[PDB]
Amino acid sequence: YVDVGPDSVKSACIEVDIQQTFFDKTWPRPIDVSKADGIIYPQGRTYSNITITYQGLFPYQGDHGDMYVYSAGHATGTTPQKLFVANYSQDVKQFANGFVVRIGAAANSTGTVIISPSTSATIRKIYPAFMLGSSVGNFSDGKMGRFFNHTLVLLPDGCGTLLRAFYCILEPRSGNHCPAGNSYTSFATYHTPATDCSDGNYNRNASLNSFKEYFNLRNCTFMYTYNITEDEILEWFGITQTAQGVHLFSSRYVDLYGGNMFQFATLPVYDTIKYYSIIPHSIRSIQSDRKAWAAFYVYKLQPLTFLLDFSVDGYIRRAIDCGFNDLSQLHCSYESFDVESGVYSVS
Amino acid sequence: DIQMTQTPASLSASVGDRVTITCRASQNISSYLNWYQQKPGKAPKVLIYDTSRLQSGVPSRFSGSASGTDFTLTISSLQPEDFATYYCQQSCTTLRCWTFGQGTKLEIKRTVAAPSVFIFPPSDEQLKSGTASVVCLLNNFYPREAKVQWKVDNALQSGNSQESVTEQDSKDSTYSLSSTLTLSKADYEKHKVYACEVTHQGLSSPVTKSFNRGEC
Amino acid sequence: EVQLVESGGGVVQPGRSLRSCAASAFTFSNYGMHWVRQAPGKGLEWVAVIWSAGSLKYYASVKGRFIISRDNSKNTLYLQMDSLRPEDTAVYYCARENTTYYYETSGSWGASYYFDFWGQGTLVTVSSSTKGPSVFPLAPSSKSTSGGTAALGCLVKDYFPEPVTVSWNSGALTSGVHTFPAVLQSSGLYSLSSVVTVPSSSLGTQTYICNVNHKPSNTKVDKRV
């Protein structure tokens, strides 16, 4: 098996405040095939400059997807008072062909922080935490989002210095605010920037310890840590489940600026994943310390044939989704990105 | 399990005085210890939760500090109303069992007061019922506890005497003790003389009074 | 706003099954219910604790004798008592307990507790050889010579169903009233007496009549001397 280190000795889990309505915002970001948003490069081989049609799991063009945002906890000027999270834990999302995440989209811009409408801070890139399980169950209190045995959990750590992925059984602690405990809230991760994000004070398992209080790790199959540089530049994360194993794709590892997705890690899980839930994250910081954070976008993938344009570097600058519309279908028929205007076959 | 014994079962303290009450557990299983103050007719109140931060709604006069296994509560400016039985509970999440306080009763400490002795012999209807109960009453004694001995024909009787103490106002410091004999009709006639002896800490001389059958 | 009441407490034979607690105008579903028992001569202890989900129940001095089932839609928590004993019999209080929240890094503390509306408690009693009340007035042999003020008292014996109410002249004189706790005899019948202080000159010249009322008996005993 694997060792996650000593379990948290905290008597009770920290109280969580759920404000889904405050978190909800109008932020539409449709997938743009033209800019090759969320498309994985063919893993088999590099391709020639001439445009080549390729068939793979791909997000629908023009699909906004699901938007999730992480915001700082309610805080008095002297100290933080309570965690602030949405109702993401209750929400359960079906996993079929896997999903692609948009990270750092709102970074490098200034927008009001979710916790205070009056307060405005520069938005900074933040990294989402995802829990994927073969099966899901109701919570002891009857809330949705409880996860069964052998559920994979991925959490970024050290303000995004490293990413930790582990597939382990989850056991709720009996402490209050934990799922087994009275007044149970929701599974969540909490970090303090001064305690860990300050240089030389980084804690390798700080995110794991906060998750451990809500759910203990029992008989974990394996624990894997991958170190990813933290950058404001937009990056894409892709996760899919195959019989050979789970595949992890990071844009930052190969083409951070391009946004093209290339597999960086292989996870040996042969169990099919049918359900995934986003894990809400709360930042424990004072009101001055609290800053706006980027909102992650999740897009489901479905098998489709996409015209692919390859640069001399070979990166896919642009793509065409034939299924999206009749105009794209005529481009797909000719297998050419640009075609002379003509009458074309239609449904 | 955990064996907890409070050092004083009862504490006598003067009004406006500074006193310490200590409860010692077998071991301090957890930092959090729930002190409880109980007043008859009043629901139990948690004086302190972790012994480091005072519980909300609790006056600053009660302060709980734990040194070693023993836990000490410090109170100042004591009042008759302030006095109440004290219970300490050690709370551990792992242990389902919860520690129970022995309870410490608080009464005023001050100059002693001499008692008054009165007799209440059983009436004819009680004798007809078959039970003879002679009541020796001690009144206005400053200690809550009092010493009474019941004897018939100057012979000690064991178990026949029943001692009941009336509720005493803490400021008044005056209590009533009733000793009631239990006897059959045959026992009543055999006991020609009933004698009650009163002993008090304030009194320097134990005193006996008696009476015989048929005064009135 | 929290309302807590306990029901089903009654006199019972030994080795009997007795049904509990009820809650109103409160968020019972997310709050666990804790049962605490107090008996004379022993300190308060938590006999049973049940989680808000109710999936897990903890019993604390008994081999899981108590059985606790809570219905959140009903808003009532049911407690079952079996193999009841005189020493075991005691008043039971039901209250909701929430642990205080704390922030380790800043030392920030949140009370996060609902100890309000602690249960008043219900008394369960095990008794044998129950008898109808037999109040007897007590007359001093020498009330006049006893002292400047003399004590006149009435003793109630073998009263039915635990507590009985005794008054002097229907409460007309409250001077020197003394209340004595009901001791439990080996027979299982409680004994208590009520005495008032009245001046010796007043005694004999003026006669005071004890008035005793028992709710089960429904009899207003009048007792003259």
The fold of B116-212 is Immunoglobulin-like (2.60.40)
Whether residues C210 and C173 fall in one domain:
yes
With contact defined as 3+ CB pairs under 8 Å, the chains touching A are B, C
Whether residues C74 and C141 fall in one domain:
no
CATH superfamily entry for domain B11-108: Immunoglobulins (2.60.40.10)
Which residue from A335, A338, A285, A343 is spatially nearest to A55, judged by alpha carbons? A335
Please tell me which of the candidates B30, B32, B93 has its beta carbon nearest to residue A174. Answer: B93
The Cβ of residue C80 has, within 10 Å, a number of other Cβ atoms equal to 14
Query: In this structure, are strands C57-59 and C67-71 parallel, antiparallel, or unpaired?
Result: unpaired
Q: Can you give the residue range of the structural domain that contains C172?
A: 134-223
Closest approach of B6 to chain C, Cα-based (Å): 11
The percent of chain A in helix, strand and coil, each rounded to the nearest 5, is 10, 35, 50
- Chosen domain end from C126, C142, C169: C126
Whether residues C120 and C206 fall in one domain:
no
* Residue bearing tokens 């939760």: B49
Which residue from B63, C77, B32 is spatially nearest to A176, judged by alpha carbons? B32
- Domain layout of chain B by residue ranges: 11-108, 116-212
Closest approach of C214 to chain B, Cα-based (Å): 19
B72: three-class secondary structure by DSSP: strand
Chain C contacts in chain A segment 249-308 (CB below 8 A): 284
Whether residues C118 and C138 fall in one domain:
no
Contacts of B32 in chain A (CB under 8 A): 11
> What is the Cα–Cα distance from C9 to C121, expressed in whole angstroms?
9
Whether residues C100 and C151 fall in one domain:
no
- Chosen domain end from C126, C148, C179: C126
DSSP 8-state code for residue A309: E
- Is-contact A57 A239, C-beta < 8 A? no
> Could you give the number of structural domains in chain C?
2
Whether residues C174 and C190 fall in one domain:
yes
Which residue from B90, C52, C102, B96 is spatially nearest to A213, judged by alpha carbons? C102
Phi-psi region of B151 (alpha: psi -120 to 50; beta: other; left: phi over 0): beta
Would you call B32 and A175 a contact, using CB atoms and an 8 Å cutoff?
no
> What is the Cα–Cα distance from C23 to C118, expressed in whole angstroms?
11
CA A134 to chain centre: 18
Please tell me which of the candidates C53, C103, C110 has its beta carbon nearest to residue A141. Answer: C53
Which tokens go with A129? 């935490």
C151: three-class secondary structure by DSSP: strand
Interface B–C counts its CB contacts (< 8 A) at: 121
Whether residues C145 and C98 fall in one domain:
no
Would you call B166 and C178 a contact, using CB atoms and an 8 Å cutoff?
yes
Would you call B32 and A11 a contact, using CB atoms and an 8 Å cutoff?
yes
As a three-state string, the secondary structure of B83-109 is CCEEEEEECCCCCCCCCCCCCCEEECC
What CATH number should be reported for the domain holding residue C219?
2.60.40.10
- Is-contact C136 B125, C-beta < 8 A? yes
Whether residues C46 and C114 fall in one domain:
yes
Where chain C is discontinuous (C–N > 2.5 Å), the residues before each break are 19, 60
Interface A–B counts its CB contacts (< 8 A) at: 6
Whether residues C120 and C160 fall in one domain:
no
Mutation target for A interface from B31, B49, B93, B96: give the one with most A CBs within 10 A.
Answer: B93
Whether residues C112 and C153 fall in one domain:
no
> What is the Cα–Cα distance from A334 to A329, expressed in whole angstroms?
9
Mutation target for B interface from A11, A174, A182, A213: give the one with most B CBs within 10 A.
Answer: A11
Whether residues C84 and C162 fall in one domain:
no
Structure-solving method: cryo-EM
